[PDB]
Amino acid sequence: QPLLSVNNLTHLYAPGKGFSDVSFDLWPGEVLGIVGESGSGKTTLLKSISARLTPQQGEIHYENRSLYAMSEADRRRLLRTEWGVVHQHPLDGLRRQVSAGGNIGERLMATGARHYGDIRATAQKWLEEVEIPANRIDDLPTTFSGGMQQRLQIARNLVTHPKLVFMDQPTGGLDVSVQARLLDLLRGLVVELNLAVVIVTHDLGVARLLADRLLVMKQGQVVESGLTDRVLDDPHHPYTQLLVSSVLQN
Amino acid sequence: QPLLSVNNLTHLYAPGKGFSDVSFDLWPGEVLGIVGESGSGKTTLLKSISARLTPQQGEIHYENRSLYAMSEADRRRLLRTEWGVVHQHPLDGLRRQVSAGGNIGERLMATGARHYGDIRATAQKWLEEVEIPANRIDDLPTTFSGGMQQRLQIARNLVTHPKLVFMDQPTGGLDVSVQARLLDLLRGLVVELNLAVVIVTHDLGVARLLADRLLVMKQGQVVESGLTDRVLDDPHHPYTQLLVSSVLQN
Amino acid sequence: MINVQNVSKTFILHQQNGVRLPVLNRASLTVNAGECVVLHGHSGSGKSTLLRSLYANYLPDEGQIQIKHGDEWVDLVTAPARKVVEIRKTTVGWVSQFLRVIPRISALEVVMQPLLDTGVPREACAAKAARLLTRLNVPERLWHLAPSTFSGGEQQRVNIARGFIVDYPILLLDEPTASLDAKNSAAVVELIREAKTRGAAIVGIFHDEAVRNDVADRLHPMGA
Amino acid sequence: MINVQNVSKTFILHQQNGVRLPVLNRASLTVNAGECVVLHGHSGSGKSTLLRSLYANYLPDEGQIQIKHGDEWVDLVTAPARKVVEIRKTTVGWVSQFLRVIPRISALEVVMQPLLDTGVPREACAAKAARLLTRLNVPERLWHLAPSTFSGGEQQRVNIARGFIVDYPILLLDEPTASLDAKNSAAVVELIREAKTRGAAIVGIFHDEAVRNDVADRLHPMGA
Ligand SMILES: Nc1ncnc2c1ncn2[C@@H]1O[C@H](COP(=O)(O)OP(=O)(O)NP(=O)(O)O)[C@@H](O)[C@H]1O
Ligand SMILES: Nc1ncnc2c1ncn2[C@@H]1O[C@H](COP(=O)(O)OP(=O)(O)NP(=O)(O)O)[C@@H](O)[C@H]1O
Ligand SMILES: [Mg+2]
Numbered sequence: 046q047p048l049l050s051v052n053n054l055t056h057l058y059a060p061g062k063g064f065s066d067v068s069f070d071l072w073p074g075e076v077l078g079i080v081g082e083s084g085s086g087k088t089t090l091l092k093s094i095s096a097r098l099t100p101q102q103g104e105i106h107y108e109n110r111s112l113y114a115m116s117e118a119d120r121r122r123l124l125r126t127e128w129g130v131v132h133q134h135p136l137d138g139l140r141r142q143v144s145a146g147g148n149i150g151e152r153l154m155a156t157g158a159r160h161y162g163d164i165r166a167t168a169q170k171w172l173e174e175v176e177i178p179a180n181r182i183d184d185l186p187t188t189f190s191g192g193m194q195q196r197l198q199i200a201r202n203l204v205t206h207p208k209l210v211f212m213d214q215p216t217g218g219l220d221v222s223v224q225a226r227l228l229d230l231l232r233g234l235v236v237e238l239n240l241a242v243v244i245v246t247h248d249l250g251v252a253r254l255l256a257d258r259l260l261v262m263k264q265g266q267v268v269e270s271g272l273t274d275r276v277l278d279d280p281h282h283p284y285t286q287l288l289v290s291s292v293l294q295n
Numbered sequence: 296q297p298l299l300s301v302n303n304l305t306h307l308y309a310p311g312k313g314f315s316d317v318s319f320d321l322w323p324g325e326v327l328g329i330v331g332e333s334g335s336g337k338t339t340l341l342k343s344i345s346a347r348l349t350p351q352q353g354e355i356h357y358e359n360r361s362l363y364a365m366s367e368a369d370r371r372r373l374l375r376t377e378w379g380v381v382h383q384h385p386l387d388g389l390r391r392q393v394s395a396g397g398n399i400g401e402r403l404m405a406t407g408a409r410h411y412g413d414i415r416a417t418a419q420k421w422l423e424e425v426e427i428p429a430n431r432i433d434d435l436p437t438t439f440s441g442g443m444q445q446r447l448q449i450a451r452n453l454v455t456h457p458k459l460v461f462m463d464q465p466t467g468g469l470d471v472s473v474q475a476r477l478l479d480l481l482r483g484l485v486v487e488l489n490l491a492v493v494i495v496t497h498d499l500g501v502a503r504l505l506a507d508r509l510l511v512m513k514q515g516q517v518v519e520s521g522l523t524d525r526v527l528d529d530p531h532h533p534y535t536q537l538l539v540s541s542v543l544q545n
Numbered sequence: 546m547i548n549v550q551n552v553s554k555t556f557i558l559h560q561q562n563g564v565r566l567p568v569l570n571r572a573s574l575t576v577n578a579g580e581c582v583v584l585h586g587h588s589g590s591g592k593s594t595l596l597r598s599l600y601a602n603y604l605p606d607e608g609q610i611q612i613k614h615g616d617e618w619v620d621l622v623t624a625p626a627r628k629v630v631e632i633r634k635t636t637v638g639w640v641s642q643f644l645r646v647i648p649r650i651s652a653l654e655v656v657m658q659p660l661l662d663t664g665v666p667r668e669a670c671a672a673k674a675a676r677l678l679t680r681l682n683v684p685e686r687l688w689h690l691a692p693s694t695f696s697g698g699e700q701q702r703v704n705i706a707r708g709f710i711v712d713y714p715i716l717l718l719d720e721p722t723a724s725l726d727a728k729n730s731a732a733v734v735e736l737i738r739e740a741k742t743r744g745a746a747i748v749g750i751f752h753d754e755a756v757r758n759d760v761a762d763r764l765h766p767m768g769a
Numbered sequence: 770m771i772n773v774q775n776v777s778k779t780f781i782l783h784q785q786n787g788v789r790l791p792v793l794n795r796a797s798l799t800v801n802a803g804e805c806v807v808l809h810g811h812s813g814s815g816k817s818t819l820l821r822s823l824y825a826n827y828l829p830d831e832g833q834i835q836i837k838h839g840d841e842w843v844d845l846v847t848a849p850a851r852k853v854v855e856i857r858k859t860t861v862g863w864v865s866q867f868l869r870v871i872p873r874i875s876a877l878e879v880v881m882q883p884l885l886d887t888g889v890p891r892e893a894c895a896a897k898a899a900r901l902l903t904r905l906n907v908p909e910r911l912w913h914l915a916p917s918t919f920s921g922g923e924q925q926r927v928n929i930a931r932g933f934i935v936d937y938p939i940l941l942l943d944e945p946t947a948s949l950d951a952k953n954s955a956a957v958v959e960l961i962r963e964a965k966t967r968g969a970a971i972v973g974i975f976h977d978e979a980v981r982n983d984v985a986d987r988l989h990p991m992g993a
């Protein structure tokens with residue numbers, strides 16, 4: 046049974062701004078990429094399904110539990126223990142005045158960790174995982190570069206080994222090498238640990254190598270969906286054909 | 296004679312953080328892409344050459360005039376009239392409380408424009424150029440999406456038809472279609488108007504299609520430089536070979 | 546066991562005046578265990594279209610492509626995406642001219658991964674990947690380096706090894722031996738014959754005459 | 770006029786134990802106006818390496834590739850990047866199997882651009898692009914649509930038209946006719962012959978025997 050279920054979800058700031066009539070199912074151990082035009086409502090949908098934006102219509106069920114019918118405490122517990130959220134801008138998902146080690150360890154302590162040495166070791170291990178030097182653990186994120194901050198946010202939202210991760214362009218600001226490292230890390234987590242990922246991306250190569258299923262969003266509506274390679278290589282909706290024709294070939 | 300000249304430029308926050316011993320020449324009507332690892336000092340170098348970060352060593356000459364030997368008023372005049380700066384995060388180069396029309400028109404008025412109708416028309420024209428709807432001119436950038444904000448910043452820094460534009464990952468947050476639109480716009484500006492661009496990017500496809508010359512930066516030093524296609528297809532320094540081998544093939 | 550009935554596909558190119566480009570019209574094809582069927586036809590007859598429809602990479606507009614999954618029968622034309630994903634993970638294997646992999650993963654792990662996804666122990670996966678690479682005469686020095694740093698032929702020997710790492714009951718082969726020299730081609734022929742012997746329903750597209758004659762057990766005319 | 774003297778190139782693959790892969794050793798080649806020189810050799814002899822060194826896409830470790838630019842002589846092995854950029858813009862043209870273009874630009878403008886970069890009026894550029902496309906029998910309906918939405922053959926007819934839009938004194942041809950059918954091939958042969966007649970120093974790599982015989986005026990053995 047789906048880990049996450051979305052039925053007739055809709056949130057509109059104004060006619061055409063946001064998303065409307067969005068439904069999809071996500072299971073453990075698979076990746077649902079979301080691709081679309083800048084302004085199609087991908088971020089609004091990601092916020093709505095991640096308990097950060099109350100919808101105007103539709104329902105979201107996580108482990109058979111309506112997401113927004115639950116108490117605010119339960120949603121915060123979800124976002125604190127078993128839900129990961131990676132924002133497009135890393136500083137939005139980071140504590141500016143808290144060191145990188147503290148940023149990673151907040152989640153660990155929220156899950157019950159109470160050994161400072163173990164938290165420090167785990168933070169250093171995850172920094173090395175995203176190839177951030179372990180000597181930058183005590184440096185504030187303001188001293189980090191855009192890619193460094195993005196990787197720190199990814200480690201922060203992945204240290205707890207969550208069951209569901211909503212990411213908004215996690216590859217943005219990353220050089221291709223660390224990008225491949227991140228893709229391998231995400232694939233390993235998804236397959237070995239049965240992690241589920243809802244990723245919004247514009248790099249259709251990353252969606253090809255990572256996403257198992259795809260949603261294509263335009264003017265706030267899902268225009269095409271299905272298997273990632275089928276959609277990319279056999280597009281049906283005009284927008285999808287434009288979109289894959291606009292890819293820069295290397 | 297070069298539009299911009301950099302000689303032995305160096306700025307280090309700490310040993311290994313920043314850039315050191317950087318020299319290069321940029322002429323009108325060409326693009327100097329900068330590619331490298333997240334943490335190589337690309338942004339620090341871009342700030343230093345854009346009059347936003349005083350170097351510890353070396354000199355920068357713009358039209359034969361030392362950049363940092365000039366008065367602060369002259370540097371601000373450069374950044375206000377004939378220099379464009381596109382930040383990695385669009386909101387850093389945008390006025391949050393000022394509408395998109397106002398954001399675009401600030402530069403125009405700074406160049407002497409004093410007709411409200413003409414400024415409005417130019418702002419709408421540039422919004423349509425980056426494919427932003429003209430009905431969003433009065434909406435604050437906080438209501439814009441990441442790609443919309445990035446395109447608004449690009450239009451703001453290109454409305455004045457500047458002679459030198461420093462961009463930090465301008466394609467970040469852009470779907471491939473509007474990305475191709477932006478690439479065509481930049482190529483047209485560079486060729487027709489002799490515009491010069493220093494662009495920091497991680498998408499090596501955009502550097503291939505746009506950059507005429509390339510710099511490859513690692514641990515704060517330029518490791519390889521030369522013709523874009525020569526560097527990409529005939530890399531010499533180990534890092535460059537790793538970097539181009541990490542590209543996701545579409 | 547493959548059962549293609551009345552599968553037809555025409556591409557609608559909205560990017561260019563929405564012109565229709567028919568490539569399959571009421572095609573059908575039956576494949577059984579321990580048999581190899583090779584699609585034969587003039588270029589543009591729908592060979593690639595049909596082969597990738599068998600792999601669900603294209604979606605026929607109408608018709609049925611029913612493949613046995615487990616002890617079931619599944620119409621890939623209407624199955625859910627999860628159903629197709631599992632059918633690829635366990636039932637329908639694919640070999641082609643292209644190694645779409647994550648750039649920085651060594652060749653041995655590129656070959657092991659499809660089997661490790663099935664829960665097989667890592668020692669068995671490593672041993673089988675090493676065996677396949679040795680049969681395809683891939684140098685030992687290249688096992689522990691990313692395929693993207695190799696030549697085209699070595700990358701393709703690695704892609705073939707990755708394709709044959711799992712014993713799929715159904716197998717698809719889009720010109721695996723095309724670029725390979727005679728020795729490496731012969732090795733791929735031997736691998737295909739072994740797959741046939743174990744009871745693999747193989748569907749292939751081959752341009753070389755000798756490879757088709759040595760491998761093909763039946764010919765399907767795609768000209769129509 | 771092309772003058773290649775003692776050009777040698779060996780690739781150092783740091784990604785794989787830093788192995789050295791020599792591909793050119795003290796090669797030389799002289800080309801004159803109104804002449805076509807075709808590189809002939811076993812695959813792996815350095816044909817592609819030398820051709821792209823002529824276009825500055827690769828950098829020979831040692832040697833000289835001196836090409837006449839304007840009324841000058843320029844060693845592409847040591848010239849500044851700006852020098853090479855201008856030499857490509859005006860002096861050294863390139864035709865290959867691949868249309869690296871911005872995705873959303875129509876075919877007519879893809880063909881016009883290299884000439885418009887030289888300041889030629891837009892009417893003349895449009896007329897010449899239309900002429901080249903008509904000669905290469907590219908349908909009129911496809912002139913105003915992006916190449917990425919076409920088939921491989923049409924994209925390659927557009928790449929050939931873009932290559933021949935400017936009358937380069939030096940021209941390089943990396944198997945332009947390879948995939949083309951006999952009619953389109955013959956059209957490309959006629960274009961190459963016209964380029965030769967006007968006084969274009971053409972350096973080519975061809976696999977087809979008939980195309981090489983019809984075009985080649987001299988053969989350079991790259992086996993050594
Ligand atoms: N706070 C807001 N108030 C009013 N309108 C908004 C607000 N946020 C977004 N809109 C609009 O809602 C639409 C969708 O927003 P969003 O989901 O952030 O787009 P997006 O698809 O993620 N674009 P991008 O980040 O470039 O991939 C856009 O037209 C936005 O301009
Ligand atoms: N304000 C700062 N204080 C101390 N150290 C800094 C500061 N800013 C950057 N550093 C370091 O300076 C180095 C280079 O910074 P920066 O130029 O922003 O990297 P970058 O190459 O642009 N990375 P990316 O944005 O991912 O492409 C990094 O190790 C940063 O962590
Ligand atoms: Mg967004």
Ligand SMILES: [Mg+2]
Pocket residue numbers: 190191192337338339383463
């Ligand atoms: Mg940066």
